[PDB]
Structure formats: C-alpha cells, structure tokens
Symmetry: D2
Subunit: 506 residues, 4 copies
C-alpha cells in the first residue's frame, strides 16, 4: 500500500520531500490565587525527507550470539525467504508480529460513511524493511548463529533446523571483553576476544587499539557488503554502571584521552559507542548501563551522529506504564505497586505520573506510591518469563482497588520486533532534516538533523536518554502519538484530535 | 484554580464565551492498489459557552434506593459537609477519588524550563460541582436512603452512622413497575409503585397516565427545590430488551400512541426517557437495555434535548479496552479473550486480521452471581495472543473492588459533563445550535455508546478521553495535543 | 523394584498369595442429647492375589482417535521403544510423568536412623506395565493414529514425526453412531460406523446386531493378538444422559430386551458396556453420562465382571478438592467457590465436605481458574485463587494408564469374609462389580444404592495405598511416629 | 456434644482415663539388588489421661502488644462475652473460625447407612476452651492493648470500640531488650524494658537477674489469678539466629553458666525459654529463630517440661506444602516453585532486615527437600534432583495486615509437556495466626495431661512436642530424626492420637462394607 495526500504543504522533487509545518505549543504560568496563565507559542518549520531509502541496511549487534541477536537474525532470514515451518499446531508462515512499524496501523481519516480508515504504519513514508537488513556483529563467544539458536531455546525446533544451513554460516566477530564490567560468571563464555596480550590472555590494556579495531570492523562490514548505511545496537549483557568523574569522561576531549589512557571507567560499550560515532553510524544502547556519559554525548554532538537508548523497554514495563496512567487519568490514586518476575535465560542469569496530579498526590493526602520491583532467576523457566504486578489503589470513601497483571511469554520474541522497530525508525530519522522559519528574515536558513539524541525512540526504551535542559517523558501512549503525529505532518496532515464533529455536531 | 489563555479566538459578551475553531479532518479513499488517497478537509466554527452555571443542579435517579443511588447521595453529603469518618485504618476525609472531572488533570503546556504543567480537569472552564447536586429520584422500594445504605453494604459503618440523620430524611418517589421486564427478585421488593388499580394493585394499564405522572414529578422536584436545571439518570435494574417493530416504536408519533395503547413494547425506562425528553431535561441510560428505540431518539431530536447512554462502563471493561488497544498498537495479535466477572449484589488492523491470516477473535464473556462477596466483586480477563515465529503471549487481568465505589464517581462524571454540554452551542462558518441530541461525547463512560445511524461506535477508552481533553482545550483557544515536543527534539 | 515383608499373615502358593487381614471400623449413633455412641467393629478377611499378571494386556478404547486415545497410544509406543525426541529444550526422553502407578512412591516404613523409606507405588505387588499394553479400539472417524496426533495438536512435532511410521499402522475400528446422543457438531466426521441400514446409511435400528458386532470385535481382537485379558475404556465424546425407565433399563432382562427392541434410551455406550460385560471384559466409563443404568449394573453382577467410572477426573477438579479439604480441616468456612474453564481440544467443542463440618455449617492447552472466598474469625475474610494452565490430554493420558493398571490389578484379587463361628469353607469372591477403588481418577464415582460417593482425593489415595499395604501384611499409616514423640 | 466409645481398652477411673494401645510400624532395609526388606514392629502402650483439665488456663505471650497478641486477647474477650459488633455487612457474632480445635471435625465412623459420622475436634476428650484463657504477657512497648489494636489495624473499628473499655486496662509487662538481636528499626519502640542500668538505659548486663525476673513474673501472674496451669508462647519480633558453640550453649550446664556471664550468644528468647523451663511451664516458640539451642533442649529434658516451636507456619506455607504433596503423589515433577508476598505490618517491617529474613527463609525450603526425597522416580541423578525455589517477602506499608501471597509452580508432564499452577492468597495475616495460636495452646495444655508407659511408671512426652508440627513451619526435632513437613500427615497424626486414646484405631479409608460385602 501507499498513501497520497492532497496538500499544498508538500512538494516532492527528485526523491526529496519538502513539507511546511507550523508547530504550536504553549507556555504556562500558575501563580497567586491559583490562576494558570497560558501563552500559546507558534514556530514554523520546513522538513526535508530523502525519499531514497537504502536497498540494504547493515546492522551490527554487540551480543550477536545471544537470545535477541540469534532471534533477530533468524526472523530476517525466515521472513525474507518465506521459510514456513512445522509446529504441533501445524505449518506456520513467518511474520513480524510484535513490531509496530511492520504490523500496526494508523488512522488516515474517514471515508464516505464517516468511519475510520487505517493504513499500515510504514505505508505513509518510505521505510526500510527488516527483510533488507544485512546483519553482523560482535560476541565474546564464537558459537555460530545456529549453535546460538540451540542455546537460546527461543525458536521452534523445526524452524531452527530449516535455518541451520544459513545460520551456521553466520559467525560473530571477536569483541572487547573487560571482565570486571559484566556479571561474575563470564570468563567461560568469553572465547572470541580481540583484546589479548603477547601471550594471548586477558588484557584491558590498549583500549585505543581496541577502539581502532572496532572502527576497522565497521569499515570492513560496510565495504564487504557494499553497504552505504549501517547502524549499531548493543544487545549484550548488561555492564556495571560507569562512574562519571570530572576530567575523565566529562567531555569529548577528556573521554578520548581517558580511553587512550586505558582508564578504569572506560567500559567495552563506551568504546563501541565511541567507535560508531567516529564512523558516523547511529548507535543504540539496548541495555540499562549508562554508556552515554557526558563526554560521549558531546562527541556525538560534535560528530553530528545519532545515538539513543538505555535499556530495551520490556513488555511488562510497557503494560505497567499504560495501566498506571489509566488509573491516574481516571482519578484513581495508586498507593502501592508490587512488581515481580523471573526467567531462566542468560539475561536474568546476568541479572542474578505522581507529578501531573496534585489533586491525588499532595502534602495533605499523600504524595507517594510505595512500589517494589523484584527480578528473580529461575533457570527451569527458560526464555519464557513470568511477570506479575499488583496494584492496590484508593477509591472514594475509604474504598480500595486491587488489580493484578500476570504475564507469560518468551521474552526474546517480544524484544526482537522492538529491536527491528528501533532500527527501522533510526534509519528513517537519518533521512530527515529541518529548518525553523524566521518570520522576519525570509531565507538564509540551512537544514539540519535532529539533536544527536533520538528521543523519538523513547517508545522502545525503558530509560530515555534525556537531553540536558529537559526531563525524560515516558508514558507509552504519549510516545506513540508523537511518532504518529510526526509521520502525519511530514505528509501534510494535522495531529489526531478525536473530535469527530461530523457526528457530535449538526 | 483557574485558567486564562492569551488568545484572540476567545470573545466575551454578557456572561458568554465565544471561541473560533477551525476543524481539520480528512476524507480517505482506496483504489485498485492499496493506494490511499487522502483529501484533508476544514470547517470553521464559533463555539458559544454560557458561563452562567446553575448554583444548584437537580439530579433525579431512577433506582435511587440501590447501590449506586445511595452511594451517590452519601458521597455528595459527605463531601459537601466534610464528614470525616472512622475506619480501622484511622479517620479518613471524604473525597471524590475515581472521578475524572473531580480528580484528574490536563496538561496546559510547558513552563519556563520546558516541563509539562497540569491543571485540574475542572479548572479550565466553569463546571458544576457534585457538592451542588440536589439529588432525588424514584425507586420501587420505599426504603429511605439510610436504610438503602445498610442494604447495599457499600460504605463504612461509621460513615453510614454519621450520615444516618440526613439519609433517613431522603425518601425515593414511587416509580413505574412493569413486572414482566425484570421481576422475581425485584418483584417482592416493589412496594413504592404509581401504576396501581382501583383495588390498589400493580397494573401495566394506564401507561400514558404513568408518563404524565413522571413529567409532573420532574416539575414538582424543580419547584420544591427552586431549581430550573435537572438531569435524569437511569441506574435501576436492567430490563429485558424490547423489540423495535414498525408501527409501534419506530416513530415518535407511533411511540407516543403505543404508550396510550398500553403497548407491551413500552418499558418503564421508555416512559422515564419520554417524560424527560418532553420535560426537556437531559436523560442518561446507565443500564444496558435498548431504551432509546428509534421513536425515542426521534422524539429527542425533535424536542432538541440531550439523550445519552447504554450501560455504565465498568472498570474491568475499561481495563480490557486499554489493554487490547495496547496490544494491537504494538503489532500484537490477540486471539482469545476468555473474560469472566461474578458479583454478589442486586446488580482497525488488517495486517494482523485479514482473510489470509484470519480476522477472527474469540471473546468470552462470563458473569456469575455469588452473594458472599457482596458489593466487592471480582473480575478476571485472560488474553492469549500470537507473537512472531510461532510464539505466544498470555496476559491475565485480575480485578477486585466494591463495584459501586467506581460507578458512583462515573455517574458524577456523566452528570457534570452533561450539564457542561447543555451550556454549549456552536455555529459553522447563521444562528447557533446545540450538540446533536445524542451526547456521544459521554462515550468514555458508557459500554454500548449510542450512535447516529451510519456511524460506527468508537470505544477506545483513551481516544474518548482525548476527545474530551481537546474539546475543553479548543473552547479556550488551545490546539489539540501533538506530543511533538519540538523544543526538546529539535536543536 | 521389589518388596519383601517378613510376616505370618501372608502365604505363597503356586502363583497365589493368601493374606489375612482384620478389618476394623465403627458404627456411630448420635443421641438426641447430642452424645456420640461409638461401637468399634472388626471383620476378618482372607485375600487371594493371582501373582501371574498378563504378559500383554489388551486395551480397547472407544474414541481411540481422539486426543486421549491418540496420546495414549503414543505414550505406550514412545516409552516402549524409548523414542527420544527433539524440543527447544534439547533432546528429551519419554516417560510416564503424571502417572501415580508409574511415577509415584509409597512409604514402607522407616530405616535404622528412623527416617522414612519410600518405594515405587508399583513395586509392592506385581502390576502390568503400560509398555505391555496392546491397544486397539473404535472411533466414528477412520483417521489412523498418526493423523489423529496431527489433528489433536497435543504432542511435540518431532515426536509425532518419529512416531509416524508406527502410529500410521493403527486404525480405529468402525463404531456405533446414534447421532441423537452427541452434541451434533460431531456428525460431519462420522465416516466409520457399523450401524448402517440396507441402503448403507446410518441406522438406529438393529441395536442387537450392533452389540453382537462389538462382541465380535472383542473376540477377534483377543484371538488375533493371542491376548488373554482385555479392558474396555470409554474416552469418547460425552453423550446425552438417558432417563432410567421402569421396565426398560431398570433390570438385566429388561435392558437386554430393550436393546433387541431398539428402544430410545439405549445409547451407543450402553451397548459398548453390555457387550463388554457379556464378554467378561472390565468396562470403564470416562465420560459424565450415566451409562451404568440399574440394568447394566445387574448384568455385570450376574456376569461377575467389573465396571467403573463416570468422567475422568481433571487436574483442576483434583486441585479444588485438596484445597477445599485443606481449608475445612483448618476450621475455615468457605462461603464462595467460583470455578472456571476453557480448553483447546475437541472435548470442549463437544462441551457446547459441607456435611463433615457441622461446627461451621449449621442452621489442547486448557486454562482453569477457581477463586475461593472464605470467612475468617471476627469478620475478616480470605481470598484464594487457583490458576492452572496445561494441555489436559497430557494429564488425562496418564490418568487413563493408572485406571487400566489398577483395574487389571483388581481383577487378580479375590477375597473371603471370614466367619468366626464357621471355620473353613467359603469360596473366594470377586470385588463388587463396581470398583470404587478407582474413585481417585473419576470425578463422579459410581456407588451402591444406599451409599454416598466419596470425593475426598486425599482419602481416595489413602484407600488405595492401605489396600496395597494390607495385601502384603502391613498395617495402615498412622503417622503417630511414637519412635519420637514418646521417649 | 460428647463421644462415648464401647471398648474394653478404656478404663475411665475417677478422672483418670487409662487406655491400652498397640503401636505398629515397620523397619525397612534396601538391598543393592534393589529389594526392600520390611520387618513389621509392634509396641504395646498404656496411655493415662487426667480427665480433669483446669477451669482457667494462664497464657503469657511474649510480644503481647503486637498484631497477634492484641488480636488473641480481643478474640477471647469478644467470644467469652459474646460481643457482637457492626460492619458494613451488618452485625456479626464473634467466633473462632480458622481454629482447628474449635471449628474442625473428625470422622468417628459410620451410621446405619454406611455414611460418615463426624464430631467436633474437641468432643472426644476434654480440652480447655479459649474462653477460659487468662491472658497477660510481656512487650518492649508499653502501649495498652486498646492502643495496640488501633495500631495493628487488624480488627473492625466497631469491634475495637466495644472492647476499648476492657482492653485499655490490659498492659504488657516490661520485657528484656537486647538490641543486637532484633531487626533494627525497633529501638524507638523499646520503652518497656527491665534490663536498665543506673541511668535507666538499656544494657545486656545481668542476664541472670533478667532470668530471675521472668521466673518471678510467671509466679506473680499465677497467684494473682489463682491459677495452677500456665503456658508461655513467643509471638514477638523475629530474632537473628544465635550461634550455637561448644562450651557455651551445647549443654544445660554450660547454658546456665553462659547466662550468668551475660554471654553474647544468649538471646532474650533463650532466657524466656530457660525461665519457663525452670518454672515447669510449657514454652512455645512462634518465631523462626533457633531459640531451642541444644543446652536449652537438655534443660527441658532434665526438668521434664514441654517445649515446641520455630516459625508460626503461615497458612500460605501450609497450602504450598499441600499442593506440592498432591503433585508429587500424582507422579508430577515440579521443577520450580516461586513464592512471593508483601505485607505492611510490623512483622514484615521487621523481616526486612536480611538477618531476620534468613530465619524465615529457612523452614521454607525444608519442605521441598522432603518431597524431593520421597520420590526417587521423579528426582534422581539421571532425571535430576533439581527443584528451583525462591522466597520473596516484601514490606509494603499501604496494605497493612493484609498480606498478599503469590506462589507459582512449573512442573513437567509426560512427553515434554508442562504445567503451570498459580496460588494467589490474600487476607489479614493475623486473623489466621491468632486461631493457630489458640490451637497450639489448647493442644499443649491437652498434652500436659497425657502420660504413657510401654508395656508388654508412666512417663511424659519427649520434651519436644513435635506433635505440634502442624502449626510450626520449622519443625523442631531430635538428633537423628528428620522433620516431617507433610501438612496432611501432621493432622492425621493428631486425629489418630485422639481416636487411639478413646479406643479407636487409625483411619484406613478401606470402606470394606461398601467395596466388598
Ligand atoms: N532477552 C530479553 O527478553 C530482553 C528484554 C528487555 C531488555 N533486554 C536487554 O538486552 C540485553 C541482551 O538480552 P539477551 O536475552 O539477548 O541476552 P543474552 O544473555 O542471551 O545474550 C547477550 C550476549 O552478549 C554477549 N556479550 C556480553 N558482553 C559482550 C561484549 N563485551 N561484546 C560482545 N558480546 C558480548 C554474550 O556472549 C551473549 O551472547 C540485556 O542485557 C538487556 O540489556 C533483553
């Protein structure tokens, strides 16, 4: 499918789309007798979109041999090659269910009877297909992707067998292993490392050489596959937070020298992110550690390359967000949120809204929500994960409400389509540039790319890497709306209002 | 708290607010190929909002002596008189928790730092407070509201006692009882009926006479309380649906005639609705039965009076909505929805669903009666969806709570919004007009939203709230929410 | 694997075992003044057990092509030939998990240090192994068992494939199809029926010829397999209950006559039951219908054959029973019990303790959920919810195996009720045709005219355990452990 | 109601029931060939029961001002004085629901129809009623019991108001406070202590005088209420396990000496235990801590005084055990059990500290091992003797005494199938523990009036009344004996004890009058 809007806001020229958009917002000021003084603001923009998308997109994953990496490669091959497979429920055709860019829809408007008309999320503007991903990456373990699948226990046995021949040919590149950064148990899995000494052992020495090695890898992968575009994504084991100290990783220059100095606060991801930036390739952090120290963020700004992330947002987390928001929107006051969960995969083994509502949360009836988060490792559960979150909330006149959400599913089958989403949306953003219109000075403007931090990806990240003078904004619903309204405006359509006046009125 | 927006779209002349609004949408078409041709549309309006709100809002509940009815009255009194009460957790202050109009907020914009600023949902435009509701109504049982509270077993004992003296003085008016629409359990309890014979017995004969008595009741309630603004809401036992047959209830003329004929397709609710429409007061159906037959809806357009309803949307039905919506918007394909919910009281994506992959979704709906639990009912909903490459996802939603403690603030929300909507009229760009008789704006609070023919009902809980949010916003010269945050995303 | 008890209560003949047992119980009589008068009682018995079990045991399932039937044959074959299979979790070995007789243990006593010593349930006495089951049966649909496995969607794909060659060889015999007894949504699949009229169409007439055909089927099955013993179990779609009518199915002669006269109330299962009894073959009803009408019960008593049943007991039913029991034993008063269910097998498609406690009570992947609301002291409350997810065929199959193993065992046991004042004499008698020892696995136990069908799961396993114990000279379990407490 | 059993086994003298009983069992040995050699064993006994129980039983609770303590007192008063109270569900009558001794029944036999006949658990032999309980006790906090109720938020507001007058007069005695033994966040509460120095500040010096004070406390409570029988029960904050060392607490000699030396391995519970033993009064340990150190156990033996305890088995745990039993007896192999739960009382707030949590963590995994142990068919080196288990107990103040417990089992079925069972449990935890406390006291009293003698001079049960393991999560046993956690087997041992004493044999369930005949 394809979409064509009749608008005077858009002009297509030589695989290039120019769109006018007037951004409206409002600045508020509450004071005195509690009066909210709101002053609307307007800012006109011109968006430019390279309509020409990569025929093939290179993807390089750190942790390629794990559950997510294994599964991501399997899904691209299975789908690209229409690899149907046998299950106890019969033959099945591959798909990308769980992917918003591949399997969700957006409301374009209404037809003749006044009913909504939805179109595929990726049918509005040109987006790259996961079927066109050319995937590679690094892993401290040398097992090929077929062996990786076997070890992960995520995919149907018969699907692994039909993909055996191809997955066996995929081997992860050696990686950077600095033992002290991951969960104890690891020196055994690590058997494919570049950072070796004269005798071929450990070594956290030569971090800048490691950095160079990684940059060569990116250059090699790019040329050997005749790839113009490449994106890097960390989906490896969570590392132990790095301390942010002045003079070391506080600035571009400082960080860069610290790496050269083989400093203790220079983790493997730090080098991967730095190497990607230096190569000009977008870098996404799918783990919770804080690799985006202030010195790295400056580097990206300096280089003018995109970065994003900090922990892939799990399904349970999303649901929690949606659920908590719903209660509050309805004026329900949650007092506690007991969250629990346990899995038996390597991820867990390694791991082995009050502000918006002062009516409910204030200094008279309570401003806090007692909530605990427990994550246990239960090996016999496998990739399958069991999450349970309970909400005990206050209702009117001394009443209470207890809601329990139980969730069971193979974690990696949820994570892989989200990785696909992060990759497709990241590529899409790279082809987007803009320029703010100066009311007074007609021209002179020059297009620019988004701020080096792609917050448009917050939908898929648990802890959004916040830009300096602003606070992170989660709220899953608010996050999809933004993405939806962005595609909309690029094609000359206004944000969704839900007013349906062609029904409520006259 | 108040909100003052600096805009040139908002006018003011004699306690009136005039706001200009350009409504944008887009008509879509599809072709041989999946080619979607979108043609944006526009229509400018001028909305007029009467800022003079009633000092007192009359509320008339059919089923005033039930769980929702008695609880509604107790919440108005407790809050209005700040009746704090004792609980084994300590003395508690009354509130309207569970009420969107009373306890939720709206984002007005950002502050100097770039942070979102939230204001009370009811602080944007003048809205009536439930503390100013004057409540009465009808019930087939003569028990006063103190006796009703005891029967309902909804509220804290101590609160019931501190409210005893006031609730004991509230007696529901006699109502219309047509046994063949509920009966049995609510059969015996019927000792407050107007439809009696000369021998003093319940009769379904003299219906039009029943209509006249209800219109009168409405009139007397206004007079005795010095109110001119009244809203009627159905929160009584569910009735057996009726048949919409031609010549009977297909037109207002036929409808009115059928009532005179003592027709059997004329339920008590048909009579309460009709009498309210005739009295020109808004009527809301908090039950699932098909009250608004075409004849009634016709009569309401003609009289130009608000009608809205069809079942108070319960909490679990709201969770389910938000839940399913979440999944589909994530590219996840729900398959099963084995839903269940027993109580012990008296009461869009063809990518996943298409021909090839299948557009079928088996939905299970169970409701059992088990009195032991009392008002505190328990709901359980289970979803089984398909993930990529043969995997599945199983989500269970368990909910426990006193049903009426969630229904009451929802009734409050409906009444508060219905009143707000009566002070609103618009004009396209002629004289002004009022919303179409069927207030679909209140869909957020009703399971089976009554809609205009040709239109499909949209039940997405979040979209319904968005509509309301955007309505209040536009009335004060604010654009819908874009969530683009370009001051944060763009250099 | 074996157990030897040093005791003078047991004598071993050729292939016989004779065990003396003194049975104690008590009769109680509560006087109006509320007093309980308890008169202890004792009744001595002599049990005889034929130790020579069948080398091969014939099994004939009605509904052989269903989820339970196809899964049963698959389990026997996989375990018998040690067919390991592939899964996401790696290579798995076949087993009989979920089977009490095959995978549970019993406490024999204590060791030197006073510690409990457990032995396999099936090691106390000789019991037939499900690996020695020779299976056949009937089904109104003729798909071979490989196709049945595909249709059921119960087993691991790789296992189905490894079992393909062998399961393909098993085809269910034609069955008796009286459409007026099922849920209708089983009419399209019926293409394997013996009850066909002149024009070859499905008829409800000639029921006596149908019954003789089933007897032919049983005799043939034995003969062709050189089988000595066979058991018949009904694990087919649930039938519509039949109303017991005087002069119709109230007695043996009546029943038999109503069959010859193609009467309305003779269900296909009635004929299967009757044919089995007439062939001296035990018969087990795994469905809820009241197949065992008075007439059938009498025909069985006269024939000296076994009958048992009324609905294979589900895992959630077993669970509820233990839970409710637990609460009542703790003095808690359950006032609410909301049970729920929804499976993924053709079982559902066709689907479309208060007397003990006078103190508190006075004047294929199925998903089950049960919630209990009980009142605690001083007005408090307790809310317990049991959520259960599993492929019920994987639970039913081992339950069917236990039923067949226990039924076979009981057929090798006979007794003599000893008379004190009448030494010697009294030829050994077989259990009462109705086997209440199998109550453990059946949701609605079949019982005698004046007795109440016990459902306490815990008690049902205790009865079975103590039975095996007494047959080898061991007393019942007291749990007194005076080895400690007293000293 | 009462039971009368016609049997030449019972000699009902002048308030002295004498009963003959032959206890059968068997000793097993397993040959390398795989054969079990079982040899039956019998032992005749004579049981003597003092039919004359006390008209009033003295109950002294350590932790009297807590959730359980105040709730127990409230239940006794409400029931004894038939104090009905109001609730949103109407006026209710007080009762002892949740109490096995007051609300469960036992099968006596059958009627003339072959049907089961049940009678009240307490109708067989005389037992003391909780209405005759005379309660007092200690607490490091001086709040009277009405304030203790308000603070616990366990009972109906109206019920508390009705009991306000009488409970305001109940004040706990000063107790012994050794700070380095409790959670931590409790020292602000410690305002009722006996162990105070010259300035009047806590101190761990003089543990023997402390010992002497508790003994006298017992003696005073007894005479002030004209009581003859008293039972002490620990229902206070869980203490940290104590370190049992040689020459300090390995022998009663050492233990008493260590106390006189204010030794640091001598906890407050250790002292209440010793004091109770020296006064000849039964001592029940309701917490998980290892109070009953070997030397203390020795003392109980030498003095001939009953002791019993270690964890007040939450109903949730009892339930988990039953289910795991049902599964293994069904041939189903659990390969994982995830326990979880959060509560907002002082119990949970205390268990926060990992040193106290450890005590509770133990006596949770114990069961799983016995179950794995009983079935070598499912659990062995070949298939795996593995069964994953985790116990998570979070403190969530917003829920109060209402504890929410969730337990999930993942078992393997045949041919690679699996089964997932979830148990969700919610209730006022103290409303389950209180009636449980009542059972332990009634059954302890009952056991004190029971003596025996092996025949072919009477004695008393071994100090450790393992007979009470049904209500104890951490069964306390002997040297060479493993604990029996099978909840079902624990009640049957009780049913069979009572039956036996009245001439009835153990239940067999054979029902030969229905199966045979
Ligand atoms: N799996 C899920 O369901 C899930 C859900 C939400 C978030 N996450 C996130 O994604 C991450 C990966 O999850 P997973 O299931 O794929 O993990 P996994 O343990 O199966 O795989 C991680 C892989 O990282 C490799 N690795 C570790 N350190 C490395 C290094 N320095 N260089 C290269 N390779 C290295 C390991 O060898 C392993 O193959 C987690 O750490 C977490 O941040 C995972």
């Amino acid at each position: 499918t394809s979409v064509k809007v009749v608008t005077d806001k858009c002009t297509y020229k030589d695989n290039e789309l120019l769109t006018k958009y007037s951004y409206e917002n409002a600045v508020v000021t509450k004071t005195a007798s509690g009066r909210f003084d709101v002053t609307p603001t307007v800012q006109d923009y011109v968006f430019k979109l390279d309509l020409k998308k990569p025929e093939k997109l290179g993807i390089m994953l750190i942790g390629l041999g794990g559950n997510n990496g294994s599964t991501l490669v399997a899904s691209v091959l299975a789908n690209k090659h229409n690899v149907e497979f046998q299950t106890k429920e019969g033959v099945k055709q591959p798909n990308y269910f769980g992917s918003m860019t591949q399997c969700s829809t957006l409301k374009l408007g209404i037809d003749a009877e006044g009913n909504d008309v939805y179109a595929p999320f990726n049918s509005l503007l040109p987006m790259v297909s996961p079927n066109d991903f050319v995937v590679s990456g690094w892993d401290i373990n040398n097992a090929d992707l077929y062996e990786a699948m076997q070890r992960s226990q995520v995919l149907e046995y018969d699907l692994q067998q039909r993909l055996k021949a191809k997955m066996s040919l995929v081997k992860p590149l050696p990686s950077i292993y600095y033992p002290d950064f991951i969960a104890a148990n690891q020196d055994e899995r690590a058997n494919n490392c570049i950072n070796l000494d004269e005798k071929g052992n450990v070594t956290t020495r030569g971090k800048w050489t490691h950095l160079q090695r990684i940059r060569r890898d990116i250059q090699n992968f790019k040329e050997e596959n005749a790839l113009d575009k490449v994106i890097v994504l960390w989906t490896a084991n969570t590392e132990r937070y790095v301390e942010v100290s002045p003079g070391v990783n506080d600035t571009m220059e400082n960080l860069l020298q610290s790496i050269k100095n083989d400093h203790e606060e220079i983790a493997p991801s730090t080098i991967f992110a730095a190497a990607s930036i230096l190569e000009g390739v977008p870098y996404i952090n799918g783990s919770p550690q804080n690799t985006f120290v202030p010195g790295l963020v400056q580097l990206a700004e300096h280089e003018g390359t995109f970065i994003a992330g900090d922990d892939l947002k799990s399904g349970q987390t999303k649901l929690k967000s949606v659920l908590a928001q719903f209660l509050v929107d309805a004026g329900i006051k949650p007092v506690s949120i007991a969250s629990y969960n346990h899995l038996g995969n390597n991820d867990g083994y390694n791991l082995s809204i009050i502000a918006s509502n002062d009516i409910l949360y204030n200094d008279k009836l309570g401003k806090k929500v007692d909530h605990c988060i427990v994550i246990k490792y239960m090996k016999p559960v496998g990739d399958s994960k069991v999450a349970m979150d309970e909400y005990y909330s206050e209702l009117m006149l001394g009443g209470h409400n207890r809601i329990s959400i139980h969730n069971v599913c193979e974690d990696s089958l949820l994570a892989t389509p989200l990785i696909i989403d992060l990759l497709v949306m990241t590529e899409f953003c790279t082809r987007v540039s803009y320029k703010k219109v100066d009311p007074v000075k007609e021209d002179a403007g020059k297009f620019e790319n988004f701020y080096p931090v792609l917050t448009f990806l917050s939908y898929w990240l648990k802890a959004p890497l916040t830009r300096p003078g602003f606070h992170p904004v989660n709220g899953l619903n608010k996050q999809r709306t933004a993405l939806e309204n962005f595609l909309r405006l690029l094609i000359g359509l206004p944000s969704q209002n839900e007013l349906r006046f062609e029904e409520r009125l006259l």
